[PDB]
Amino acid sequence: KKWIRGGTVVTAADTYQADVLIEGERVVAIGHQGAEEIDATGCYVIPGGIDPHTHLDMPFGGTVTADDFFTGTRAAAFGGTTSIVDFCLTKKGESLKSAIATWHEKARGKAVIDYGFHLMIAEANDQVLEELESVISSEGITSLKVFMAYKNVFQADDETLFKTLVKAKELGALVQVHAENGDVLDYLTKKALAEGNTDPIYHAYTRPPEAEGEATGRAIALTALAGSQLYVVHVSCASAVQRIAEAREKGWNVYGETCPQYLALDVSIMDQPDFEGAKYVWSPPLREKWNQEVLWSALKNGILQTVGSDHCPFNFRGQKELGRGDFTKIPNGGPLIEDRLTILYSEGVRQGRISLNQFVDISSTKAAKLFGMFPRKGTIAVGSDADIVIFDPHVKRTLSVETHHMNVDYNPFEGMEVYGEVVSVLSRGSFVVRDKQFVGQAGSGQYIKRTTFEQA
Amino acid sequence: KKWIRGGTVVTAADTYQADVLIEGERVVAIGHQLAAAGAEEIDATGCYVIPGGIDPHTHLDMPFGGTVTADDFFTGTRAAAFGGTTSIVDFCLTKKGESLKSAIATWHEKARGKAVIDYGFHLMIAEANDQVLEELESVISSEGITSLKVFMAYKNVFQADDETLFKTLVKAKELGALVQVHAENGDVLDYLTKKALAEGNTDPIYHAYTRPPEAEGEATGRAIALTALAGSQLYVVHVSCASAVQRIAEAREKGWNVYGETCPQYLALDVSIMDQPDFEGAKYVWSPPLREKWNQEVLWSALKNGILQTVGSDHCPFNFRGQKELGRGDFTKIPNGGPLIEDRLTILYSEGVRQGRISLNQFVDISSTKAAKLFGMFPRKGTIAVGSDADIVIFDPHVKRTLSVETHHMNVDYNPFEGMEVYGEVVSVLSRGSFVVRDKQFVGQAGSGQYIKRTTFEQA
Ligand SMILES: [Mn+2]
Ligand SMILES: [Mn+2]
Ligand SMILES: [Mn+2]
Ligand SMILES: [Mn+2]
Numbered sequence: 001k002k003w004i005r006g007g008t009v010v011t012a013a014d015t016y017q018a019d020v021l022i023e024g025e026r027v028v029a030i031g032h033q034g035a036e037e038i039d040a041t042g043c044y045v046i047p048g049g050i051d052p053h054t055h056l057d058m059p060f061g062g063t064v065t066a067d068d069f070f071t072g073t074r075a076a077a078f079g080g081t082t083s084i085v086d087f088c089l090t091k092k093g094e095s096l097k098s099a100i101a102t103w104h105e106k107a108r109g110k111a112v113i114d115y116g117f118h119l120m121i122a123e124a125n126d127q128v129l130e131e132l133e134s135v136i137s138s139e140g141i142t143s144l145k146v147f148m149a150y151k152n153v154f155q156a157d158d159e160t161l162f163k164t165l166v167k168a169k170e171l172g173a174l175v176q177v178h179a180e181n182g183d184v185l186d187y188l189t190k191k192a193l194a195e196g197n198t199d200p201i202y203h204a205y206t207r208p209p210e211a212e213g214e215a216t217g218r219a220i221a222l223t224a225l226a227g228s229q230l231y232v233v234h235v236s237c238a239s240a241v242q243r244i245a246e247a248r249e250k251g252w253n254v255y256g257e258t259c260p261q262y263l264a265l266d267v268s269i270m271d272q273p274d275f276e277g278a279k280y281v282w283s284p285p286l287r288e289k290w291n292q293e294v295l296w297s298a299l300k301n302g303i304l305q306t307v308g309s310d311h312c313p314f315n316f317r318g319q320k321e322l323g324r325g326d327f328t329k330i331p332n333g334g335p336l337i338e339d340r341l342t343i344l345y346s347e348g349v350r351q352g353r354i355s356l357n358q359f360v361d362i363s364s365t366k367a368a369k370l371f372g373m374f375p376r377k378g379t380i381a382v383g384s385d386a387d388i389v390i391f392d393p394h395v396k397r398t399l400s401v402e403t404h405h406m407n408v409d410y411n412p413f414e415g416m417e418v419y420g421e422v423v424s425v426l427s428r429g430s431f432v433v434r435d436k437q438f439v440g441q442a443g444s445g446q447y448i449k450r451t452t453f454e455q456a
Numbered sequence: 457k458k459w460i461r462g463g464t465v466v467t468a469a470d471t472y473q474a475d476v477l478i479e480g481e482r483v484v485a486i487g488h489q490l491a492a493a494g495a496e497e498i499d500a501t502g503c504y505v506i507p508g509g510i511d512p513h514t515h516l517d518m519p520f521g522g523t524v525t526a527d528d529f530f531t532g533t534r535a536a537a538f539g540g541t542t543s544i545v546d547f548c549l550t551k552k553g554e555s556l557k558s559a560i561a562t563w564h565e566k567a568r569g570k571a572v573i574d575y576g577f578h579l580m581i582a583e584a585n586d587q588v589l590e591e592l593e594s595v596i597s598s599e600g601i602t603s604l605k606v607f608m609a610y611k612n613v614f615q616a617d618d619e620t621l622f623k624t625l626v627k628a629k630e631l632g633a634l635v636q637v638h639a640e641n642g643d644v645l646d647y648l649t650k651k652a653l654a655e656g657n658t659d660p661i662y663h664a665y666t667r668p669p670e671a672e673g674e675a676t677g678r679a680i681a682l683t684a685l686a687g688s689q690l691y692v693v694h695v696s697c698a699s700a701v702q703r704i705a706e707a708r709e710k711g712w713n714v715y716g717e718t719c720p721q722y723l724a725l726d727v728s729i730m731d732q733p734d735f736e737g738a739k740y741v742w743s744p745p746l747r748e749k750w751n752q753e754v755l756w757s758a759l760k761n762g763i764l765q766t767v768g769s770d771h772c773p774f775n776f777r778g779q780k781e782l783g784r785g786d787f788t789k790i791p792n793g794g795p796l797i798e799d800r801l802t803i804l805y806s807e808g809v810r811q812g813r814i815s816l817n818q819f820v821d822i823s824s825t826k827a828a829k830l831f832g833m834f835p836r837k838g839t840i841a842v843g844s845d846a847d848i849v850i851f852d853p854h855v856k857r858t859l860s861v862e863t864h865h866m867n868v869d870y871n872p873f874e875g876m877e878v879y880g881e882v883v884s885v886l887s888r889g890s891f892v893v894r895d896k897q898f899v900g901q902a903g904s905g906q907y908i909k910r911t912t913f914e915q916a
Contacts, residue, residue: 157617158643166647183618184685187626214681221674225644 006041012361022386025428048082048387053308061331070110071407078405080341082387096131111445124163140449149180165226172452179215198326200277204285213239229253236284238294256304260343278320311337346418372451386429395421462501468821478846481888508542508847513768521791530570531867537892538865540801542847556591571905584623600909609640625686632912639675658786660737664745673699689713696744698754716764738780741790771797806878832911846889855881
């Protein structure tokens with residue numbers, strides 16, 4: 001038994017002042033009038049972040065991502081996030097269970113906060129189409145990623161894409177896509193080398209917005225044809241929001257996600273001199289600052305509805321260095337998991353782009369309702385896991401590597417001045433972070449078995 | 457020397473009355489009181505005098521199924537002539553691992569000595585590996601070809617992938633070639649196709665529901681996006697539905713060079729006609745399929761406000777008996793295609809001009825001129841001006857006649873517009889100032905057709 005009193009609680013809908021009362025793992029009562037007191041006067045009390053886009057301990061390049069399931073989830077916790085959903089990678093000619101098996105073992109004993117999996121799909125031949133039944137019922141997985149890019153590495157063709165969509169329809173699974181046209185990026189990529197333009201800046205100009213716009217449109221069209229449901233990850237540009245908007249107007253179930261770096265960084269930052277740009281090499285690439293406004297408008301009027309990190313990080317030394325000679329080899333990815341919550345707060349709420357209620361919905365709730373974790377996760381209500389987060393909106397602080405908790409040598413928002421700080425984080429009503437201290441234990445994270453798809 | 461007098465001449469722009477004067481192969485002067493010293497008179501009082509149709513979409517003597525198309529280059533071009541058309545542009549098919557010249561070589565020999573009117577080729581592209589990218593240079597300069605078709609459908613038969621599609625676009629940019637695409641998503645059609653069989657829906661009607669509009673919309677959009685990325689230029693052939701015109705409109709608003717084509721059957725037929733008891737629907741099996749009647753209006757609006765700009769036949773015909781019969785058991789095997797080359801011109805006239813959908817000047821532009829300018833045959837073809845080949849067509853707009861197999865000239869056992877009452881009739885057709893058809897009689901000769909070497913792309 002724990003007792004948060006003095007708090008002003010904020011949810012996707014509500015904003016009020018009241019004591020919440022945790023017992024065991026769950027919120028149990030809320031209101032006025034022997035248990036561990038915890039004072040939250042003047043702080044906001046909010047549901048735990050959920051970050052539906054993670055790659056902890058992933059291979060990409062001949063190397064692996066810096067954070068593991070321990071360092072990763074700690075950093076998430078430190079930065080306000082209580083549940084992640086990571087991407088389990090399948091390998092063509094591929095016992096689907098032996099993949100999942102591997103991703104469980106990647107977490108077991110390391111994770112400190114709760115976590116679920118998405119399942120990647122590489123080919124959709126009969127073998128795989130079969131296993132999918134077992135996994136959705138037995139293995140607690142109900143969302144499926146197909147990459148339309150990374151040619152000859154993760155890329156699916158329209159066939160796989162469609163078959164998966166129709167099966168997803170049949171089973172109750174959310175298909176997710178990385179919507180860039182592999183084929184056109186490859187050419188532009190191999191051409192930019194032909195000409196000897198090998199700086200990291202050309203990672204950005206070798207995958208122009210028109211190519212995200214295109215795959216997004218495409219993946220939407222099949223969804224339409226299939227009668228299934230879509231969730232485009234990491235929408236970075238206007239070309240794509242446009243296509244998403246358009247379909248949602250016709251009433252199809254298409255969904256949208258961004259990350260902070262597309263809300264708060266632009267391409268100019270890549271054009272820097274000493275390989276500094278490689279700090280920004282990730283896919284889709286950063287975009288002209290015009291786009292940030294559109295992405296934000298989308299979040300505000302409910303056109304995009306979730307935000308994730310696509311945390312997938314590599315050290316500037318040794319790892320990002322892997323391709324000084326050429327940007328093909330820079331392992332694509334950023335360290336984004338920790339600051340996500342608070343840049344949403346500071347750049348969005350604090351400067352009048354979204355409401356405080358929307359800030360919760362965008363970072364926590366809506367992701368739960370789309371990924372089948374609701375109401376166990378993503379709200380403060382009676383019954384819900386006590387993934388609470390006490391949050392001080394008044395702090396002014398500067399984001400830096402010197403002070404972040406991710407296991408990486410840099411921070412892409414380095415030097416950015418920001419409001420708001422995470423004071424303490426509960427996970428199922430145990431402290432993971434208290435007064436800004438890691439009091440958690442590795443292995444305390446539980447897998448979350450998610451339910452099948454349902455609307456919002 | 458020939459002398460058309462009494463005529464009211466109509467072009468893409470002009471409409472006036474005057475005598476034209478042909479000498480040799482070419483128009484030479486126009487007006488009143490010309491110097492027509494002892495030259496063959498030809499009376500055209502009360503008829504319209506117009507440039508020859510150009511039909512930029514033909515497959516004469518093509519293999520599709522294990523069988524070949526009914527018309528050859530002789531029966532075909534004759535029928536074209538009978539129905540107002542003086543120049544075609546046919547699709548030369550390449551075969552993966554494929555001397556590009558040995559394909560072309562074949563398509564020349566398919567025409568030589570058979571063709572009666574002039575003809576050019578498009579070149580199909582199956583893969584765009586380095587070997588092929590190389591040959592393209594030779595062909596555009598030497599072989600007179602400057603337009604390139606990539607099929608986004610017909611999986612495991614003619615289908616290209618986005619790679620081929622893009623590489624070809626960027627090359628086309630570089631060389632000066634118009635890329636053309638058949639914009640349907642092969643992959644989604646295959647699945648729907650193999651599913652419809654799974655369930656035992658094998659009638660020809662399911663040819664139409666196994667390739668819904670959303671799938672044309674999608675490929676059209678896609679093909680446009682690469683064109684954008686490539687800086688190249690596009691020509692979507694046979695737009696059948698609103699989903700695609702929309703995508704074409706959208707891009708032409710942003711100013712890119714994207715172009716559009718329909719055929720008559722999408723302007724004048726709808727899906728209901730497929731749902732018929734016995735194998736009757738197989739008469740309509742072709743791709744893209746017929747569509748809901750709502751779409752006709754949009755296609756027409758597009759032509760009128762300049763959003764689509766050409767019309768072709770996609771004449772590719774097969775006999776109802778024996779040939780279309782090839783798949784009573786299932787529609788996968790119906791060889792896809794219709795007999796559309798002959799009536800094209802006059803349905804454009806009768807359903808469009810005559811009922812107030814387009815202007816008479818537009819009717820020429822839509823059937824003749826604009827196709828010349830996009831395919832690099834202008835001003836040799838597609839207008840009545842001094843210098844231009846004398847591909848004239850005297851045309852009687854007052855006739856009322858019923859279209860039928862009993863009376864058409866294509867070498868096929870049926871007519872898809874069978875029974876349709878129509879205004880306008882072709883009286884006589886000249887090709888480089890020799891009669892091919894006179895007072896509705898075939899006075900032409902096989903072999904008189906000349907290949908047209910076309911120029912590289914340029915706007916409009
Ligand atoms: Mn991605
Ligand atoms: Mn990702
Ligand atoms: Mn076609
Ligand atoms: Mn065709």
